[PDB]
UniProtKB/Swiss-Prot annotation:
Preferentially expressed in liver. Expression is also seen in the hematopoietic cells such as bone marrow, thymus and spleen. Lower expression is seen in the heart, kidney and ovary. Part of a complex composed of EEIG1, TNFRSF11A/RANK, PLCG2, GAB2, TEC and BTK; complex formation increases in the presence of TNFSF11/RANKL. Interacts with INPP5D/SHIP1 and INPPL1/SHIP2. Interacts with CD28, FASLG, FGF2, GRB10 and KIT. Interacts with VAV1 and JAK2. Interacts with LYN. It comes from Mus musculus (Mouse). Undergoes also tyrosine phosphorylation during platelet activation. This is Tyrosine-protein kinase Tec. The modification Phosphotyrosine is found at Y27, Y49. Non-receptor tyrosine kinase that contributes to signaling from many receptors and participates as a signal transducer in multiple downstream pathways, including regulation of the actin cytoskeleton. Plays a redundant role to ITK in regulation of the adaptive immune response. Regulates the development, function and differentiation of conventional T-cells and nonconventional NKT-cells. Required for TCR-dependent IL2 gene induction. Phosphorylates DOK1, one CD28-specific substrate, and contributes to CD28-signaling. The lineage of its organism: Eukaryota, Metazoa, Chordata, Craniata, Vertebrata.
């Protein structure tokens, strides 16, 4: 599965290369590169280096049965 980089932690982008982390926004993973600094998309255009260590996918296999 892809495009499921759910941002849980907050981060501030002051440059441009690195993207910020918005708690609640489900980002779209574009590039990987190890487990730390990935490259994802914000909304509909903005992208950049995003520490996936601050994001989370489908939280492992928690919602298998959902409830």
């Amino acid at each position: 599965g892809s495009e499921i980089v759910v941002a849980m932690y907050d981060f501030q982008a002051t440059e441009a290369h690195d993207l910020r982390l918005e708690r609640g926004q489900e980002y779209i993973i574009l590039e990987k590169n190890d487990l730390h600094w990935w490259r994802a998309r914000d909304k509909y255009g903005s992208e950049g280096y995003i520490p996936s260590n601050y994001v989370t996918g489908k939280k492992s296999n928690n919602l298998d049965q959902y409830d």
